[PDB]
Design an enzyme around this catalytic site. Structure first.
Site, PDB file in Angstrom:
ATOM      1  N   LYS A   1      44.733  35.565  10.231  1.00 38.91           N
ATOM      2  CA  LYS A   1      44.078  36.861   9.910  1.00 38.91           C
ATOM      3  C   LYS A   1      44.710  37.962  10.760  1.00 38.91           C
ATOM      4  CE  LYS A   1      39.345  37.249   8.596  1.00 38.91           C
ATOM      5  NZ  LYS A   1      37.980  37.050   9.129  1.00 38.91           N
ATOM      6  N   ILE A   2      45.289  38.982  10.140  1.00 39.17           N
ATOM      7  CA  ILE A   2      46.012  40.078  10.848  1.00 39.17           C
ATOM      8  C   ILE A   2      45.357  41.418  10.491  1.00 39.17           C
ATOM      9  CG2 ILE A   2      48.303  40.993  11.361  1.00 39.17           C
ATOM     10  CD1 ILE A   2      49.293  38.441   9.628  1.00 39.17           C
TER      11      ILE A   2
END
Ligand SMILES: *[C@H](CO)[C@H](O)[C@H](O)[C@@H](O)CS(=O)(=O)O
Ligand SMILES: *[C@H](CO)[C@H](O)[C@H](O)[C@@H](O)CS(=O)(=O)O
Ligand SMILES: *[C@H](CO)[C@H](O)[C@H](O)[C@@H](O)CS(=O)(=O)O
Ligand SMILES: *[C@H](CO)[C@H](O)[C@H](O)[C@@H](O)CS(=O)(=O)O
Ligand SMILES: *[C@H](CO)[C@H](O)[C@H](O)[C@@H](O)CS(=O)(=O)O
Ligand SMILES: *[C@H](CO)[C@H](O)[C@H](O)[C@@H](O)CS(=O)(=O)O
Ligand SMILES: *[C@H](CO)[C@H](O)[C@H](O)[C@@H](O)CS(=O)(=O)O
Lengths: 216, 217, 217, 217, 217, 217, 217, 216
Positions: free
Chosen positions: H89-90
């Site tokens: 998750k960025i």
């Protein structure tokens, strides 16, 4: 989208064909009167100008005094035997819709013109007319809003092959309305088409760009 | 609802005033050119015909080459002194909106013309212009939909007294669009007004009633 | 909401006036041909059946052949010297709107008829016509949708006193369409009004209520 | 917003009046049949129960077999003298609308019932009926949809005093549809009104609040 | 728009009154349980805190086990005597609407709570309840869309004085829907109100303005 | 409709005030970093330029590092004492809204700025702020549609006197959006206002009218 | 959805390619008066940087003074012979549309630019132009609403292969408007694209997530 | 329609997987903090719990204190190499979108999170992100209406295989707003899902059915 030049002058029909890629030409007894040439002369010129040209429909209205569906099918025949590009234009009357059904049965392409309602336009499509010309400008001049979307939607819902030619167009905003509706063809005079291709903000940007070029 | 005759031909302004009840005559440098008479002549004949007539606004555009608001307030002051019916027509430009604010401060009625957006219409209203002429026909000829309802709604929401004159009208359906919007005045040529009063179904019915009358005693 | 009887038969005008409370009567050259009586007689009989009544407008049309606003002024003035209740019905044409303006200036009530657009309907309002009759049925018979709301809205937006008489009505959903729009008057034939007051579900409920009444002491 | 009890049972009329503040009572030949008492008996009880009560309308339908106006105005002129709270309920029929106009002229309040269209509801208003009862449930049992907003809008646009009583209501969501439209009164059975005041989420929250109250001091 | 703090904690009621200008306080048996204090103490600290304060309504729900409109008009009357700011909160039950009508007749302000439909809410308004609390959050938690606009529109159409308190609000987007509907009051917890006053684009601009101030003399 | 110049440059404020009739001036901690002059020097030139001019609000933001409503209330009092034409601009934060309520109670006009939600705009008006500045441009730069109509409606609905100043406007179409919504004031840079008064179709018509004038005698 | 960089600075074209995956580059005579390098230099650099990068259109406008379709076809043929990535940009003028039809017949890709109306975007596609650039920002600066959906909807109906490049975009909300319409490509400056990828709530959440990470093992 | 459990508690992840058929699990640095266990521990447990389970995405966000696309494509690679179910998750930042384009090119599934506009969501799509998480509950807590319909419709006019895991959902009414739009996934905590399955008119009817079952 096809752009038919609503004119009976060869100089403008030759220009629009070579520069604007017009897809056809529509004429009415008033356009031939304004030509200044006799009807048969205008026809001979149109027949030779596009002798070989294929897929270039040339709508030509028969005698507007004809009142019988039989004197129409015998006059629009002499005419259709002058050029293969010629499409007999017949008004939206009872003798006209009877004459347009007989013509279409003999294989003569017909353009049922002077249609001002979606009910006057459904019958031409139920007798296999090649074209149906719903008029806009005339109704507007009398304060009536212009039923074109209804005809397009009806034609589509019932898979009709008749092609709709929105006629009496006077400005490019009406070409954009016909095109927003889904009309097949739009017939307009030479000047309506020229002005439709122009805008003031194109001349404004051109001046801003012509400056930045001269400062480089 | 006011109907202003957009013409500089008196014979037409005479008829339309005596038969259609025109509420005023607008004009532009192109209407005066088509008149065939010199500008000052057209003004004298319009300043005489409508001498006593009160409430008959006659919009007259100043030199279109004027680029300074000072040269405008001076040319339009002279034209305004030729008849009390005359309303100086000024283009919606920087030097026109500055000149329209001056004239309006000196009590000279002004018609800020050549307005093609509701943002160009709001400034004329904030400077107390008597009239603002939003153009329709020109934008349509280039494929643009015609912002008139926005101007009417803005003018109303902010209680502005400036009267909107929808201009460049070419058909009676565009006169019905301006009336449906709530525009105050509508300026149209003599022929646009005549055809707007006529309908094919009115000739159809008059043939049906003309025949019934002939089969009656 | 006024209900005018579109009829020239005094026997149906008398019934409607007493039982349905009609507020007026309108007659075209075709209704006076279907009457079977001469016109000047259909007139004498309305001039006498309502001599005492007032606020009961009786619209009556002139030679459907008159082409000049002057010959239309002379004929409608005579037809108006017949009864205070008589409103001269004039077609929406060039000389009809000129004749309706002269009539209204002399105090003769006029009903500008055969109006089929909101643009032909605005001019009658501008010259102070007492009534404007926009036709519906005729346009529908040719496949055209029926502009009535536009006229009502325009009339209201510009505070016009002209009363709109929706004409050529053929059913009661068209009377309900005119009422939903805000039209002042609706003119309809005797049978259109009778059927509009009736419903199948009223006969269904009546049978259910008749059965209950019987099974009750 | 008035809530009339559509019932002929005085145990339900007495409860709803003391606990729900009903503003009136409507009855039909089927409600009197289901009462089990004779019609005249139900009337005597209703007349005594609300002898002094003012502004408590009690709609009572006349013989549903009556086919003539003259015979309607005679059976309801005699039902009206039995209490000042009684409002003669007449079907929307030709003879009923003629009888409702005569009744209203003599000062006898009338409730033109069995109206299933806005065209049938306009005439009752054009004759000064005190109440007009447009029916909902019956049209919807047959698949149709409910005009109960057209009638409200028409009544309002033409400033009519006739009060609309939406009838044949079967659920509170239809009470909320009539209120959203602007109907003056809604007539419903005792059980339709009780259930309309109840919700499952009110019983859910009540249980959550009854739990906390027990975990507090 | 009024903002009532949905809390039984006097540290949050004191802060919101002095800094946010809350216009009132609503409590339910669950808010008093979460207070940790006895109901009587929480009701004797609210009475002293706002002893003189006028126009500061403090909604207090009676025993949720009460099933009779009598034992609930005896227990509620008791609380209403302990302070003039107290408004008895009664659920939307049948015994509650009967008890809310009796109280409202004796001049004791009532807040008919746990209303989850516009029908469950039209009755509280027909009996003169001071407040009606339509709940939003509870219905949403079960996947139901939240009828608030209908209640506002009905209340307005029938000129009802009952003030609507949208309850169970959980976010500021719901406070803006109540406001966009026209609700009179919105009751929310202290944290719902704090976060509603904050945005992350107010912290972004603050950083941009703090950088500019620094790069300036 | 008020047009405030969002600028700290007095050459643009003086031109706008004399030619465009600006109704006020708004400044932000960054428009001052751009003026080149030091903060209190900018203020002192604004105080003298508009010492006589009454009703010309000059919004001036206090130190953006201020975190306490007491420090904010101590610093905005000093700035406000340097001119009556000064309106203290405070960010929409917890302490800014607490400081804006104290300021408004002492009679110091406040402009609660950096409002990006219709919910952040409500406490501002619920405490009598003179102005509330909802920002548009910043949200759009991040791909968010710009809630302005909601604030105008919520403000109208609850009849609030706070005047809305739509801020961060970048084009005349956004000025036409604010006017169509009903916003009281619009703050824009000098160039946004100049371009908003200009149109390419006015230069087109000017050329057509300049060609005609040249062919007229 | 293609994102073309409206730039002539190769530091921004090289970054956007390597990091944002731009699908093409559009330039105009004013973007090259801003790039400093002479025109032919900018072209040589663009030709080498993209010597073997297929599907990277590089729109390059010809001399804006060219008034003949023959002079435009000779100048644009020379520019097109400098690279295979280059697409001759021609103004929507009479001779530009004649020159764009000849160019497309010879197999030279053309981008008919400066289109401000949907009637102008129709001759362009009725001659097989590879690209049509409808401008948004310029019209908005003059207070005009921006016809883009009409062009998209007209191209889809008639099934024109011409790809629409919405130009003069100035914020990410206008990029979201073009994407919601169905435009094929959007051309924007480097800064419009960077800000469109950023939001203040992403910095807010990042701070909340950075605080949590720290208070975690 | 996928229902991902927005939780880092394995008692709730185990229950929802066996009884509610959850299709995946999303976590954020705040869910791991509330877990009470160290980050690497939560990951080891999640890796073993779903060792073989296929098509069960487990979104795991990397250091929020990273600003270089290079230290973010170096901290993810390590995590992604702990379980094949893990999806990095960025945040939707310049260096996050640059790091998400490098990850997607190396075949590491990425979930571009903290997206609050349809413009901030289109770039994740143009770089082939597996998932894009548009937040709703955070914008509404500040009075903003929640664009989630235009992210879905743009991801469809342009055929984008990126899947919209709409996040910050707090009531069943938002789990239904997302479904009415056409979102591919929706992430909600254990209890926003339990309450979404319950209604008061289900307990009311149950008492009617329950009573009518002692009368039969
Ligand atoms: C034929 C229809 O297909 C004609 O060309 C038509 O009359 C009108 O298009 C034009 S106008 O009113 O005569 O200008
Ligand atoms: C004045 C505006 O109030 C003029 O009369 C105007 O130019 C246009 O109305 C007409 S046209 O384009 O010249 O026909
Ligand atoms: C007068 C209008 O006010 C007439 O009575 C009118 O012609 C029409 O209403 C009726 S019909 O078509 O002749 O039936
Ligand atoms: C009177 C109308 O005002 C009656 O009470 C009516 O018939 C209906 O309301 C009810 S039902 O269909 O008989 O239930
Ligand atoms: C009273 C209504 O006026 C209460 O305070 C209400 O229960 C709810 O607002 C709140 S919650 O669900 O208990 O949060
Ligand atoms: C004050 C608000 O009333 C300021 O002038 C505001 O910051 C913005 O309007 C402008 S900008 O973003 O700094 O351009
Ligand atoms: C080409 C169109 O395809 C150009 O790059 C265009 O002019 C404009 O996009 C930009 S600006 O107004 O010069 O900023």
């Amino acid at each position: 989208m096809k752009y038919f030049l609503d004119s009976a002058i060869l100089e403008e029909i030759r220009y629009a064909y070579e520069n604007w890629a017009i897809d056809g030409v529509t004429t009415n007894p008033r356009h031939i009167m304004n030509s200044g040439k006799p009807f048969l002369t205008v026809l001979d010129e149109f027949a030779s100008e596009f002798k070989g040209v294929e897929n270039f429909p040339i709508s030509v209205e028969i005698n507007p005094h004809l009142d019988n569906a039989k004197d129409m099918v015998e006059e629009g025949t002499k005419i259709a035997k002058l050029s293969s590009n010629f499409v007999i234009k017949i008004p939206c009357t009872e003798p006209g819709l009877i004459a347009a059904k007989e013509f279409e049965k003999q294989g003569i392409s017909t353009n049922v013109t002077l249609v001002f309602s979606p009910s006057q336009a459904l019958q031409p499509a139920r007798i296999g007319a090649k074209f149906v010309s719903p008029f806009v400008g005339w109704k507007e001049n009398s304060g009536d809003d212009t039923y074109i979307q209804d005809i397009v939607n009806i034609y589509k819902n019932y898979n009709y092959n008749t092609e709709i030619i929105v006629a009496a167009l006077r400005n490019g905003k009406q070409i954009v309305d016909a095109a927003k509706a889904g009309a097949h063809i739009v017939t307009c005079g030479f000047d309506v088409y020229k002005e439709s291709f122009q805008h003031a903000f194109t001349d404004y940007g051109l001046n801003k760009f012509r400056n930045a070029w001269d400062n480089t």
